[PDB]
Amino acid sequence: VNLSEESARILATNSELVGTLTRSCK
Amino acid sequence: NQVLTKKKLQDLVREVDPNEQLDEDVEEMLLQIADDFIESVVTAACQLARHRKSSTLEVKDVQLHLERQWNMWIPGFGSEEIRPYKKACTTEAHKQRMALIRKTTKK
């Protein structure tokens, strides 16, 4: 049960720090 | 109605080595090579499009000519999901003729 909930916490912080605004380019 | 304009070509040389010039002959020949490449790719893609019994040139048949002949994969376009790869449709006639090469060899 410890392995199941802690696996998604390595990826949840990978959606708060990196990629805040979405850019584009000509 | 020209597609390359000798300033986009000059920056293509400046991005490689900025202390390098081309001569008039080299520039003309490079423009000619670009025009020939465009013509060949377009004709082959159009023949594949005519084969799909369609009248629109999609990006799926400019892909198949550059990959098979020119060894070019242009990344940023994306395709549909490739179907499950059929490996060997070896027919029964080959399964019985090749089972005669071994029958004479060891027996």
Partner: protein, 87 residues
Amino acid sequence: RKRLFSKELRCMMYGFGDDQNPYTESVDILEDLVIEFITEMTHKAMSIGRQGRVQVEDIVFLIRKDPRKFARVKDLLTMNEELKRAR
């Protein structure tokens, strides 16, 4: 096709020095490259070794020439065996 690697690839480009906020078009090019690489490796693996089956042994023969990728595969497999032993 939709993008199945849009949020994961932005963490990876930051991991190799790009930015915290890369461009969507660059992320798209990287996603297309990854899908093409996986497809090519899978076809060659189906041809080599057991026909119609992709195995770790076939993948290892295919990646043998390139040093960086071969080292990573070996390290991951050994670490996986060690973690299973610890469990």
